[PDB]
């Protein structure tokens with residue numbers, strides 16, 4: 001019958017899930033980044049189309065998508081037209097909006113997305129509010145890019161002899177395949193503006209942290225608390241006592257722990273939640289075309 | 300007679316001073332950035348040639364230059380060949396080396412350059428040692444770029460309502476001609492990789508600081524201390540009780556004050572010095588070709 005696809009077009013990757021209109025799962029698909037600021041509009045759209053095609057096993061009737069990078073009116077006006085050519089019916093929203101809707105389903109609340117970039121999104125019963133979520137230079141506190149940059153800067157200070165070399169040191173050098181200061185410099189000058197390459201270093205930080213390296217742990221702690229502070233601010237403003245946590249950074253057990261500890265000390269409850277942003281997009285699509293959301297229930 | 304030109308090819312601008320071989324001043328000239336990482340090799344060389352031509356009022360016989368951006372073997376091998384076509388005799392060194400030589404004239408010591416980028420350079424009697432000075436992404440703590448980025452990130456948090464808007468807020472918006480969050484985002488996406496545009500914001504921070512804005516002062520303090528800590532490390536390693544301070548950031552009275560206060564609390568004496576990096580290059584050229592450095596003395 002009808003094929004409805006929900007999509008999370010993020011900075012790290014694009015994830016899509018397809019369902020019919022009767023709540024039944026059809027399939028899933030993944031592709032590259034959906035943030036056009038990082039891969040360009042042509043490729044971002046191509047990646048979304050690919051993820052959708054894979055999940056639907058062909059053409060889709062309705063596509064709902066949460067998108068990273070729609071940070072200005074300019075961003076929206078150039079993205080919308082192209083994204084609408086993907087299927088007969090297409091629904092587009094900022095990724096923070098979809099991630100939050102996926103969980104609160106129309107009710108007030110706050111969600112945090114911590115992936116290649118980051119954002120805190122809330123809903124006060126009347127409108128959506130955003131804190132951060134404006135790119136790597138201006139924002140993205142506690143994101144993978146933010147963590148990767150901090151690690152790179154720390155590694156140089158270790159090479160300079162300013163600080164002792166820790167586990168993090170070799171984890172980073174191996175990740176980007178660099179053996180000395182000279183190679184690190186060259187890597188930086190040709191990788192400086194490639195957000196994905198810097199963000200990829202967050203994995204090295206997580207590995208070093210899991211092995212007890214306080215230097216790596218400090219980076220994760222600072223990033224998590226910088227972002228968590230924004231979540232606490234918005235939660236208090238909206239009047240909610242809980243915040244939902246989504247994104248690849250929360251797959252870092254230590255990062256997640258520092259984030260939850262901060263929220264808890266500030267009287268806020270954290271919840272990873274049961275609903276992904278992509279299924280949130282499916283739900284929004286269901287509402288748009290009239291499919292019964294309760295049919296998605298399964299056990 | 301013989302025309303000798305000393306050049307400081309930095310991240311902010313290129314400055315040149317011409318003298319004959321008898322210690323007499325001929326003229327000075329300025330042009331754009333000499334750091335090829337920021338303007339490309341073609342333009343960097345063009346800027347150096349222009350500054351030299353202006354100062355010498357024509358062709359020069361000898362050109363000595365301190366250059367920002369020679370941070371790897373790769374950088375040197377591509378820069379040297381072109382720079383040698385500027386005059387019959389050309390001497391090339393990293394800018395930190397020349398800035399330090401200008402003051403200690405062959406003796407051990409430590410110098411700090413804080414301009415668009417930053418670096419701490421020392422000499423232990425046998426070789427030159429560098430700390431930092433590897434570009435905007437990996438380093439440049441307390442540089443104009445570093446300060447500009449911190450200001451931009453703070454301004455967004457003010458727009459988000461996370462912190463109260465201070466004097467700094469409007470100083471920044473006016474500097475980059477932006478009126479709201481939407482325009483700031485667009486500016487960021489088209490100015491993100493233009494180091495000069497981000498570094499230009501340091502002026503706004505200085506203005507706000509001079510007017511008593513603690514938020515702007517905090518940025519200058521953090522940057523100055525991050526860089527000053529590196530200077531203290533190198534001064535102690537080399538065994539010197541003083542550090543020379545050079546660069547446009549020291550024209551910020553508050554930045555300079557925070558820098559000197561930190562050094563002093565750590566038992567180190569600061570000195571702006573009497574000799575510029577460009578005259579340091581003239582002195583090195585004098586040594587190379589056999590002109591008497593003492594002839595430069597004047598009153």
Ligand SMILES: OC[C@H]1O[C@@H](O)[C@H](O)[C@@H](O)[C@@H]1O
Pocket residue numbers: 010011067068069070071095096113114115116117118119133134135136140
């Ligand atoms: O995906 C999380 C956030 O990442 C940031 O880099 C983007 O600018 C935001 O639009 C997005 O919400």
Ligand SMILES: OC[C@H]1O[C@@H](O)[C@H](O)[C@@H](O)[C@@H]1O
Pocket residue numbers: 309310366367368369370394395412413414415416417418432433434435439
């Ligand atoms: O000019 C100060 C420093 O600025 C940095 O951006 C450059 O990478 C260094 O080579 C230079 O020494």
